Ligand binder design. Structure first.
Ligand SMILES: [Cl-]
Ligand code: NA
Length: 131
RNA sequence: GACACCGAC
DNA sequence: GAACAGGTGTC
């Protein structure tokens, strides 16, 4: 474990359903950011937004710490700069799809060296940002 | 299919 | 705390 890191995760009520996410200091569990709930989204959209918010957070603070995510899906989406969600686009899902499109747009207009690391839940237990 | 992840004593 | 039925994604 790279203890000098940011861990991020989604939490939801329903999937699809109400989605939020947070970022914590891996060593302490201190909460560094938390997103206001978004009324309908998916687990994987939330995981993606959490990583990209973490990138933005660390870049603004000139931090070189890595990010841990437990999401193989979201780590791939970030590497690709494309969130390949199945969630239908409708008036109910407009909000989350706007956030996702904006996060992709951030990735296409900024650089980062931040390592995005898979949290190994099977070895290490739940990620520290788990709800 | 395998894997990573997220309502109801 | 501990003991069936879902969706969202990749490989
Ligand atoms: Cl960054
Ligand atoms: Na985890």
């Amino acid at each position: 474990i790279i203890w000098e890191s940011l861990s991020v995760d989604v939490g939801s009520q329903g999937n699809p359903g109400i989605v939020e996410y947070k970022g914590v200091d891996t060593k302490t569990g201190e909460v560094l950011f938390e997103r206001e709930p978004i009324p309908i989204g998916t687990n994987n959209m939330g995981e993606f937004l959490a990583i990209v918010h973490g990138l933005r957070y660390l870049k603004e603070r000139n931090s070189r710490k890595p990010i841990y995510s437990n999401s193989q899906t979201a780590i791939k989406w970030v590497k690709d700069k494309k969130a390949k969600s199945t969630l239908v686009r409708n008036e109910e899902t407009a909000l989350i799809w706007k956030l996702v499109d904006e996060a992709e747009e951030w990735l296409n207009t900024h650089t980062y060296e931040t390592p995005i690391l898979k949290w190994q839940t099977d070895k290490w237990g739940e990620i520290k940002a788990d709800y």
